[PDB]
Amino acid sequence: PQITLWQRPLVTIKIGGQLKEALLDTGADDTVLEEMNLPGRWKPKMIGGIGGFIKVRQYDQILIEICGHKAIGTVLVGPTPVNIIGRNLLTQIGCTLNF
Amino acid sequence: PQITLWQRPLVTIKIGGQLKEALLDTGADDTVLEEMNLPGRWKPKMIGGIGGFIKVRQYDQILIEICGHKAIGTVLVGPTPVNIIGRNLLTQIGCTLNF
């Protein structure tokens, strides 16, 4: 698809047997999703942006569906207002910036 | 330029007489530059990110040269680690997100 940046480049993902809307982000190295039921082994981690470091939990070998795109990647769960798709996954569905 | 996400999409910018390097962020609505000598009048609005809440001094109608591309707009100056280019300017150099 060609996502023009006039509005937040929101997009529906499919994780956990769940339907969500996430923000395609070239400025996230990592995919950080808001709190939700996920199964398996997790793992402490820390990340920060504008205003402070936040503690998220690491989860690897996880499947995710982006705009009808499948992809196994590490996802991070924490208190973020929006669900963010970072470069770890955006690289995977073939996504490139273009101007 | 076609930009892939294997590496952080850093680009160069000429601003306020100086050469910097900024991150092109589709998940940022506004540009927020590292604290520098900017000439003019500002108003300090406050911004929200995954960190927390940092204070910035906005500046309206500044000219910015991005990866050779000219654009005039509102810049936010502040306690940031990396210079960020939100969509307030990327709408402008005409950049889209492909995949």
PDB file of C-alpha atoms in Angstrom, chain A residues 9-96:
ATOM      1  CA  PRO A   9      -0.295   5.819   9.734  1.00  0.00           C
ATOM      2  CA  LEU A  10      -2.504   3.536  11.795  1.00  0.00           C
ATOM      3  CA  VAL A  11      -3.000  -0.039  10.744  1.00  0.00           C
ATOM      4  CA  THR A  12      -4.733  -3.180  11.911  1.00  0.00           C
ATOM      5  CA  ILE A  13      -2.560  -5.958  13.310  1.00  0.00           C
ATOM      6  CA  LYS A  14      -3.638  -9.396  14.495  1.00  0.00           C
ATOM      7  CA  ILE A  15      -1.905 -10.756  17.647  1.00  0.00           C
ATOM      8  CA  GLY A  16      -3.029 -13.340  20.308  1.00  0.00           C
ATOM      9  CA  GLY A  17      -6.170 -14.299  18.459  1.00  0.00           C
ATOM     10  CA  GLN A  18      -6.828 -10.536  18.777  1.00  0.00           C
ATOM     11  CA  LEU A  19      -7.711  -7.589  16.525  1.00  0.00           C
ATOM     12  CA  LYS A  20      -5.919  -4.248  17.207  1.00  0.00           C
ATOM     13  CA  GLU A  21      -4.940  -0.999  15.381  1.00  0.00           C
ATOM     14  CA  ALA A  22      -1.213   0.010  15.498  1.00  0.00           C
ATOM     15  CA  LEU A  23       0.935   2.937  14.453  1.00  0.00           C
ATOM     16  CA  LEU A  24       3.444   2.141  11.690  1.00  0.00           C
ATOM     17  CA  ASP A  25       6.688   3.709  13.135  1.00  0.00           C
ATOM     18  CA  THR A  26      10.066   4.030  11.358  1.00  0.00           C
ATOM     19  CA  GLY A  27      11.399   5.683  14.545  1.00  0.00           C
ATOM     20  CA  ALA A  28      10.820   2.606  16.724  1.00  0.00           C
ATOM     21  CA  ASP A  29      13.650   0.015  16.641  1.00  0.00           C
ATOM     22  CA  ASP A  30      11.229  -2.226  18.525  1.00  0.00           C
ATOM     23  CA  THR A  31       7.567  -3.104  18.402  1.00  0.00           C
ATOM     24  CA  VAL A  32       5.958  -2.192  21.712  1.00  0.00           C
ATOM     25  CA  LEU A  33       2.321  -3.213  22.323  1.00  0.00           C
ATOM     26  CA  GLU A  34       0.003  -2.159  25.060  1.00  0.00           C
ATOM     27  CA  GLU A  35      -0.855  -4.601  27.811  1.00  0.00           C
ATOM     28  CA  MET A  36      -2.731  -7.724  26.822  1.00  0.00           C
ATOM     29  CA  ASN A  37      -3.090 -11.429  27.250  1.00  0.00           C
ATOM     30  CA  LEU A  38      -0.186 -13.248  25.693  1.00  0.00           C
ATOM     31  CA  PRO A  39       1.061 -16.754  26.442  1.00  0.00           C
ATOM     32  CA  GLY A  40       4.548 -18.184  26.892  1.00  0.00           C
ATOM     33  CA  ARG A  41       7.820 -17.090  28.515  1.00  0.00           C
ATOM     34  CA  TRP A  42       8.292 -13.339  28.985  1.00  0.00           C
ATOM     35  CA  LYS A  43      11.294 -11.272  30.082  1.00  0.00           C
ATOM     36  CA  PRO A  44      12.027  -7.961  31.806  1.00  0.00           C
ATOM     37  CA  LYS A  45      13.354  -5.084  29.644  1.00  0.00           C
ATOM     38  CA  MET A  46      13.478  -1.282  29.590  1.00  0.00           C
ATOM     39  CA  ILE A  47      12.879   1.362  26.964  1.00  0.00           C
ATOM     40  CA  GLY A  48      12.396   5.130  26.906  1.00  0.00           C
ATOM     41  CA  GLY A  49      11.636   7.996  24.606  1.00  0.00           C
ATOM     42  CA  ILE A  50      10.549  11.561  25.361  1.00  0.00           C
ATOM     43  CA  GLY A  51      10.204  11.975  29.145  1.00  0.00           C
ATOM     44  CA  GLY A  52      11.472   8.727  30.834  1.00  0.00           C
ATOM     45  CA  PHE A  53      12.427   5.001  30.646  1.00  0.00           C
ATOM     46  CA  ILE A  54       9.563   2.495  30.842  1.00  0.00           C
ATOM     47  CA  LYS A  55       9.649  -1.170  31.811  1.00  0.00           C
ATOM     48  CA  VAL A  56       8.312  -3.596  29.207  1.00  0.00           C
ATOM     49  CA  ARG A  57       8.519  -7.400  28.958  1.00  0.00           C
ATOM     50  CA  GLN A  58      10.359  -9.194  26.181  1.00  0.00           C
ATOM     51  CA  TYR A  59       8.654 -11.994  24.196  1.00  0.00           C
ATOM     52  CA  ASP A  60      10.402 -13.691  21.238  1.00  0.00           C
ATOM     53  CA  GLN A  61       9.293 -16.270  18.520  1.00  0.00           C
ATOM     54  CA  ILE A  62       5.856 -14.529  18.404  1.00  0.00           C
ATOM     55  CA  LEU A  63       3.546 -14.306  15.341  1.00  0.00           C
ATOM     56  CA  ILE A  64       1.880 -11.075  14.214  1.00  0.00           C
ATOM     57  CA  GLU A  65      -0.279 -10.147  11.198  1.00  0.00           C
ATOM     58  CA  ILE A  66       0.161  -6.632   9.764  1.00  0.00           C
ATOM     59  CA  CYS A  67      -2.367  -5.438   7.164  1.00  0.00           C
ATOM     60  CA  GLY A  68      -2.593  -9.084   5.980  1.00  0.00           C
ATOM     61  CA  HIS A  69       1.103  -9.757   6.381  1.00  0.00           C
ATOM     62  CA  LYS A  70       2.496 -12.559   8.563  1.00  0.00           C
ATOM     63  CA  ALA A  71       5.663 -12.103  10.619  1.00  0.00           C
ATOM     64  CA  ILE A  72       7.321 -13.822  13.625  1.00  0.00           C
ATOM     65  CA  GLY A  73       9.226 -11.230  15.753  1.00  0.00           C
ATOM     66  CA  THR A  74      10.058 -10.134  19.283  1.00  0.00           C
ATOM     67  CA  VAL A  75       7.246  -7.904  20.678  1.00  0.00           C
ATOM     68  CA  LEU A  76       7.388  -5.776  23.857  1.00  0.00           C
ATOM     69  CA  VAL A  77       4.540  -5.347  26.297  1.00  0.00           C
ATOM     70  CA  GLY A  78       3.943  -2.270  28.296  1.00  0.00           C
ATOM     71  CA  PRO A  79       1.975   0.842  29.055  1.00  0.00           C
ATOM     72  CA  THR A  80       2.188   2.806  25.807  1.00  0.00           C
ATOM     73  CA  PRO A  81      -0.942   4.838  24.750  1.00  0.00           C
ATOM     74  CA  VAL A  82      -0.697   3.552  21.120  1.00  0.00           C
ATOM     75  CA  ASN A  83       0.569   0.150  19.889  1.00  0.00           C
ATOM     76  CA  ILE A  84       3.835   0.793  17.863  1.00  0.00           C
ATOM     77  CA  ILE A  85       5.274  -1.295  14.963  1.00  0.00           C
ATOM     78  CA  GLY A  86       9.043  -0.589  14.912  1.00  0.00           C
ATOM     79  CA  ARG A  87      11.712  -1.474  12.436  1.00  0.00           C
ATOM     80  CA  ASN A  88      12.173  -5.024  13.719  1.00  0.00           C
ATOM     81  CA  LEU A  89       8.869  -5.945  11.997  1.00  0.00           C
ATOM     82  CA  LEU A  90       8.552  -3.211   9.369  1.00  0.00           C
ATOM     83  CA  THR A  91      11.619  -4.513   7.635  1.00  0.00           C
ATOM     84  CA  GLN A  92       9.913  -7.877   7.490  1.00  0.00           C
ATOM     85  CA  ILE A  93       6.701  -6.984   5.666  1.00  0.00           C
ATOM     86  CA  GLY A  94       8.862  -5.207   3.028  1.00  0.00           C
ATOM     87  CA  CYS A  95       8.126  -1.616   4.105  1.00  0.00           C
ATOM     88  CA  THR A  96      10.374   1.287   2.851  1.00  0.00           C
TER      89      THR A  96
END
